[PDB]
Structure 1
Amino acid sequence: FKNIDGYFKIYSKHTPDFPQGFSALEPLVDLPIGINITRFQTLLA
């Protein structure tokens, strides 16, 4: 994710410690939010 001049950007790739082979990422959404953001948290199930 990023928020350069707004325009919230989300990318995602699902590949069926950490894998070493290269992986790409495809944008699904691109929405111009244009707000001030400072902190991040993740929800759970």
Structure 2
Amino acid sequence: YFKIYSKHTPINLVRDLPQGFSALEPLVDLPIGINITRFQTLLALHRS
């Protein structure tokens, strides 16, 4: 089971992480049953 916990916070800090407390609510409990050892995030390009 692959558990995704998520939280959205309105912030106004310019560069680094804000200092505070925010508990992450569980979002998706996912029934995959597969081996995961490596990951990579996906970004979006802007074309002009």
Q: TM-score over 0.5 for the alignment? A: yes
Q: Distance in 1 between matches of 2:7 and 2:35?
A: 27
- Which stretches of structure 1, 4 residues or more, deviate above 3 A after TM superposition? none
Specify every segment of 5 or more residues in structure 2 that has no aligned partner in the other structure, as ranges: 11-15
Q: Following TM superposition, by how much is the alpha carbon of 1:31 offset from its aligned partner in structure 2, in angstroms?
A: 1.4
Q: CA RMSD in A?
A: 0.9
Secondary structure of the 1:9 match is strand
Sequence identity (%): 97
Tell me how many residue pairs correspond in the alignment.
39
| Greater length-normalized contact order (CA 8 Å, ≥ 6 residues apart) | 2
| Bigger Rg, which one | 2
Q: Following TM superposition, by how much is the alpha carbon of 1:33 offset from its aligned partner in structure 2, in angstroms?
A: 1.1
Partner of 1:41: 40
